[PDB]
Design a protein around this nucleic acid. Structure first.
Ligand SMILES: [Mg+2]
Ligand SMILES: [Mg+2]
Ligand SMILES: [Mg+2]
Ligand SMILES: [Mg+2]
Ligand SMILES: [Mg+2]
Ligand SMILES: [Mg+2]
Ligand SMILES: [Mg+2]
Ligand SMILES: [Mg+2]
Ligand SMILES: [Mg+2]
Ligand SMILES: [Mg+2]
Ligand SMILES: [Mg+2]
Ligand SMILES: [Mg+2]
Ligand SMILES: [Mg+2]
Ligand SMILES: [Mg+2]
Ligand SMILES: [Mg+2]
Ligand SMILES: [Mg+2]
Ligand SMILES: [Zn+2]
Lengths: 25, 129, 102, 220, 87, 130, 96, 219
RNA sequence: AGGGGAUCGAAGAUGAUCAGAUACCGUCGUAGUCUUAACCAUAAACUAUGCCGACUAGGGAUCGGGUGGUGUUUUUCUUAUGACCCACUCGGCACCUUACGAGAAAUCAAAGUCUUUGGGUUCUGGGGGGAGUAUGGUCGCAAGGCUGAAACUUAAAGGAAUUG
């Protein structure tokens, strides 16, 4: 990927992880 | 700013010798620079140099001879015992036949050979050869 | 590797420059790196001056010229032959191409 | 080996005539050399030794051209060195041209004393540096009997030089043998190019050997 | 340089730049050995008699060889008021 | 298509350089000359030599050309070079016996301390658009 | 120049600077963090004893075509399971 | 030193000034030359003719030093002075190179144009830069007829004069010829004007040689 | 959040190409684009060149300032201006040639005065991935920012130029 896209995909994964964490808490 | 006046002086003399000049203008002058110049003059690496008063800070006009190849200041005036001076003269001076580590003792500013003969040692000023 | 010393942009001391739009692909490009051409032409071509001159009530009327500055994007201009690739040693020749009309 | 050697260049004519006695006056006046016969004649004992044969490969659209870089060093082990690098197609011609180039590129060195001069100099007269490419070699004087401390290539070059003892310090990628040899050669040739207080007396500029015997040259 | 006994053990004593007192290397292939023949009283050049100048390759490549040579000639009194020690 | 490749050019140049006085304008004469003063394997090659040498003859009779240098044309050079006007252009003769210069060079002459006829006249400091 | 402090009274900054930049070397970081103890299969140890669990023929890398016969072993010192190679031709059949 | 017979005569200074040697320098000036005298308000630096002539006599001594005349080679690629170079080399035993230099003639020893002269003279450094470089490569002095804008690399004796006017270069070549001939000894003494008059050195362009050919054939 | 609301326009609505096209092209079109307070603190925020000093090489120009010109026009009869021309100087964006030094070079008048290694100083990097990820802090309403690993894996990744 472009490093730009890798960063964006990682950001979306972080967003999903934070949503799951907020649901769990 | 201009931290070490002698560093400026020796940088100027080295640059001009490399360039090929026969005279340099050391812009700010100081007692320590004068003594450095006296040492090099006594040993012959310099020709006839002249001081100029300006009521603010002296200027120096040094007539070289091209015999000099490279001077240089050891800017942090390190402390050298009478034993470590051999290490310093091995590190800086090319060969033990010639070359002088100009250093300041309580007896005055003077090269390493005279300093050894007087059996004194102080802080290192620079190296000339 | 540095393709050009002047970066092919020609600012060197302004941080940022206002951008202007291409006239062919409507690209926003900085005005300095905008490879501009002044297109001074007549309203009629050389093949029509005769008919207009003979179909004119004014005998000595001289037809006026149309003026406009053209700001290209770089890609359109490399495509539209107005700007030409050069050999590496000939890149640095800044002077405009020598006038063929000598 | 038919050393017929029709001499072109004035120096060749002079040395064939015998008016040139030693390479001393050759190096005295920055006298250029273009014929290897001259250096062969003045110093008849140039030991040679090839140092490397590196195959290099250029590529055109059909196959690969394979040439050979021969790197050779020559000397007399008595204060004269010469480096020769040359590319060629066949090996024998490669080493031949390389040794010719080395003989042209011969250089005197300045063997000095580590301290308390006794008998004969063994090491260099001073610390020296030589940088080619990114390889920078430092030649620093050695006490008697310390040996030639260097990589095998530089060690063998110094052996052909004639120095008995010297310490070395290489920096960069000395891996590239050709660059290392060039750097060491430049450093060891620089030994003269350094004003030493024992070499301070102003000389009288003895007349050049070309001028005094210019009549002998220009064969007619 | 000099052996303990007192023999010139150094290989060869090289010349020096007559303008800058800098050493002239063996392969310093830009240096020049300028000769100036002496002249007698009535205006003839004495053969085989000449003053010498050795100009280093470096100064020649710099382009200041003319200035140094002119200065040397005036210091030797071969040129009359051509160089000014004050410029 | 007939371009007379390397060999005929070289041979012709060498022949003219070496044997100028004994080459003529006629083709067949030069053919026989090149036959006698050069060893040529095939007759066609010698014919081409003769042709281009005749071309060189015509060129040299028109005027001296580049590259070629025979001894006789050095005599034409001697004649043209040795010509000289009897009256110098410089020797204070033209422009009504006047050396027309400006003030600074007059000061130069006076400073050198020698007597020269001068005619001082200042030049306007104005610089035109050019 | 040489943008590290150089005055006499700058021993502190140079010392802390070197202590901080020493964390770049992999060997120094491994030594200080004790990675050879906490996480390495061997506790900073050259050898250790273990028990064979089963035998595996691992296929080689790209240019090499062969199977390298290894054995999975559970270490007896801590219990971590790890594969291990067996040298020479007729040796896997020698491993009971 | 040189005796007072080696001073500048009124005749020679008159000849120099008439040739407009003093008007050579252009608007641009390089710090390589202190030969300037004054800056004309029109914008022409004026060359100090005395120092010039002194450079000529120094150069004449330089050439007189070398015993073998063909070891002096006079080079010119500029049209304005190639004829003067030819004539100079004809008068002395120097060897002339006119126009194209055939680069590599000093270094490559196989070349048939190989010349290895102990001295070389160059009409113009800007034009004969290749000659300067190839003289540097094999340790040769160059007595270059510099201008006050000609660059001074590798030139040892720089004779300042005009190089934009053919009169100046022709006359300066003649002066150098006269002085080297006098110092050689064949000429008896340095008081009479030389038998060969200076304008025989000036450049002859094709239209002028055409006019003179017509005049000579007229009789 | 509040005021705007023309153009342009992410999302979308579509009309075509395409094997597929919720992409390139064409029509519309919300948020934004513009503002007022409050946040955010990231960009190839690039000259990919930290700052302050001294020295080293020539060339014109250009901008601002100051000097002189019996300078040129101007015109208010003329001074005085102003605008120009010439020379110099201080400071700035740069540019041109060159290396004598530098670099692995491409190139640099600083990236020089660095093995002949030291003018004063902050901040970074130590093979490539893993990864600017996990975790822990802290800032932020949120997006995210700052700080920031390791296990493991790999023999290269990469720079510059050369020939195809
Ligand atoms: Mg103080
Ligand atoms: Mg690219
Ligand atoms: Mg600014
Ligand atoms: Mg297998
Ligand atoms: Mg709103
Ligand atoms: Mg859409
Ligand atoms: Mg659709
Ligand atoms: Mg719309
Ligand atoms: Mg950032
Ligand atoms: Mg950055
Ligand atoms: Mg910054
Ligand atoms: Mg890593
Ligand atoms: Mg990463
Ligand atoms: Mg956290
Ligand atoms: Mg990259
Ligand atoms: Mg690449
Ligand atoms: Zn466009």
């Amino acid at each position: 990927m472009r490093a730009k896209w890798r960063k964006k995909r990682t950001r979306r994964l972080k967003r999903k992880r934070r949503k799951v964490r907020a649901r769990s808490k | 700013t201009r931290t070490s006046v002698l560093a400026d002086a020796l940088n100027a003399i080295n640059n001009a010798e490399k360039t090929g000049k026969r005279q340099v203008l050391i812009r700010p002058s100081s007692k320590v620079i004068i003594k450095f110049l006296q040492v090099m003059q006594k040993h012959g690496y310099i020709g006839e140099f002249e001081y100029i008063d300006d009521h603010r800070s002296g200027k120096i006009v040094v007539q070289l001879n091209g015999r000099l190849n490279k001077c240089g200041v050891i800017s942090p005036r390190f402390n050298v015992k009478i034993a470590d001076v051999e290490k310093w003269t091995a590190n800086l001076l090319p060969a033990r036949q010639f070359g002088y580590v100009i250093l300041t003792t309580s007896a005055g500013i003077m090269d390493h050979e005279e300093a050894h003969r007087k059996h004194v040692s102080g802080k290192i000023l620079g190296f000339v050869y | 590797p540095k393709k050009r010393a002047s970066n092919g942009r020609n600012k060197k001391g302004r941080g940022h420059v206002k951008p202007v739009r291409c006239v062919n692909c409507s690209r926003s490009v900085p005005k300095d790196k905008a490879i501009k051409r002044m297109a001074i032409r007549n309203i009629v071509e050389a093949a029509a001056i005769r008919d207009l001159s003979e179909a004119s009530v004014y005998a000595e009327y001289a037809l006026p010229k149309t003026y406009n500055k053209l700001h290209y994007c770089i890609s359109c201009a490399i495509h539209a032959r107005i700007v030409r690739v050069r050999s590496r040693t000939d890149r640095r020749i800044r002077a405009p191409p020598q006038r063929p009309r000598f | 080996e038919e050393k017929g050697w029709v001499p072109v260049t004035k120096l060749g004519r002079l040395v064939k005539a015998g008016k040139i006695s030693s390479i001393e006056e050759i190096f005295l006046h920055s006298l250029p050399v273009k014929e290897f016969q001259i250096i062969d004649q003045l110093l008849p004992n140039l030991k040679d030794e090839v140092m490397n044969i590196k195959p290099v490969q250029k590529q055109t659209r059909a196959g690969q051209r394979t040439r050979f870089k021969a790197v050779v060093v020559v000397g007399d082990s008595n204060g004269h060195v010469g480096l020769g690098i040359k590319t060629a197609k066949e090996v024998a011609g490669a080493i031949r041209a390389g040794i010719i180039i080395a003989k042209l590129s011969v250089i005197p060195i300045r063997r000095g004393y580590w301290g308390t001069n006794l008998g004969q100099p063994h090491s260099l007269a001073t610390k020296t540096s030589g940088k080619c490419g990114s390889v920078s070699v430092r030649l620093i004087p050695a006490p008697r009997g310390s040996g030639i401390v260097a990589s095998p290539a530089v060690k063998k070059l110094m052996q052909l030089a004639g120095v008995e003892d010297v310490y070395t310090s290489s920096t960069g990628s000395t891996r590239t043998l050709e660059n290392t040899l060039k750097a060491a050669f430049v450093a060891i040739g620089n030994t003269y190019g350094f004003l030493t207080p024992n070499l301070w007396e102003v000389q009288a500029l003895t007349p050049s050997p070309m001028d005094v015997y210019a009549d002998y040259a220009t064969a007619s | 340089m000099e052996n303990d006994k007192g023999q010139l053990v150094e290989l060869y004593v090289p010349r020096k730049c007559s303008a800058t007192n800098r050493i002239i290397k063996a392969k310093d292939h830009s240096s020049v050995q300028i000769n100036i023949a002496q002249v007698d009283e009535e205006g003839r050049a004495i053969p085989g008699e000449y003053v010498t100048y050795a100009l280093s390759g470096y100064i020649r490549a710099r382009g200041e060889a003319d200035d140094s040579l002119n200065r040397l000639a005036q210091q030797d009194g071969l040129l009359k008021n051509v160089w000014s020690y004050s410029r | 298509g007939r371009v007379r490749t390397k060999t005929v050019k070289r041979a012709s140049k060498a022949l003219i350089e070496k044997y100028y006085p004994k080459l003529t304008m006629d083709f067949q004469t030069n053919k026989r000359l090149c036959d006698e003063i050069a060893t040529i394997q095939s007759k066609r090659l010698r014919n081409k030599i003769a042709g281009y040498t005749t071309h060189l003859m015509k060129r040299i009779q028109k005027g001296p050309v580049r590259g070629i240098s025979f001894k006789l044309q050095e005599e034409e050079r001697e004649r043209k070079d040795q010509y000289v006007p009897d009256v110098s252009a410089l020797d204070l003769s033209h422009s009504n016996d006047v050396l027309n210069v400006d003030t600074q060079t007059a000061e130069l002459v006076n400073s050198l301390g020698l007597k020269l006829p001068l005619s001082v006249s200042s030049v306007s400091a104005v610089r035109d658009r050019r | 120049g040489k943008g590290k402090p150089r005055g006499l009274n700058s021993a502190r900054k140079l010392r802390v600077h070197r202590r901080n930049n020493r964390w770049a070397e992999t060997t120094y970081k491994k030594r200080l963090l004790g990675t050879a103890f906490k996480s390495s299969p061997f506790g900073g140890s050259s050898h250790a004893k273990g028990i064979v669990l089963e035998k595996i023929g691992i296929e080689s890398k790209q240019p090499n075509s062969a199977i390298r016969k290894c054995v999975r072993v559970q270490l007896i010192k801590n219990g971590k399971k790890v594969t291990a190679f067996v040298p020479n031709d007729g040796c896997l059949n020698f491993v009971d | 030193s040189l005796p007072s017979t080696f001073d500048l005569t009124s005749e020679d200074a008159q000849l120099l000034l008439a040739a407009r040697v003093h008007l050579g320098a252009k608007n641009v000036q390089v710090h390589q030359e202190p030969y300037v005298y004054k800056a004309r308000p029109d914008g022409v630096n004026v060359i100090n003719v005395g120092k010039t002539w002194e450079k000529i006599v120094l150069a004449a001594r330089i050439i007189a030093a070398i015993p073998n005349p063909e070891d002096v080679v006079a080079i010119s690629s500029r049209t304005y002075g190639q004829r003067a170079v030819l004539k100079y080399a004809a008068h002395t035993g120097a060897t002339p190179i006119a126009g194209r230099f055939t680069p590599g003639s000093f270094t490559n020893y196989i070349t048939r144009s190989f010349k290895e002269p102990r001295l070389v003279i160059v009409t113009d450094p800007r034009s004969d830069a290749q000659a300067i470089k190839e003289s540097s490569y094999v340790n040769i002095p160059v007595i270059a007829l510099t201008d006050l804008d000609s660059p001074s690399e590798y030139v040892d004796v720089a004779i300042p004069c005009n190089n934009r006017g053919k009169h100046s270069i022709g006359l300066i070549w003649y002066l150098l010829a006269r002085e080297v001939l006098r110092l050689r000894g064949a000429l008896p003494d340095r008081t009479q004007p030389w038998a060969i008059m200076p304008d025989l050195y000036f450049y002859r362009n094709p239209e002028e040689i055409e006019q003179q050919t017509a005049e000579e054939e007229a009789v």
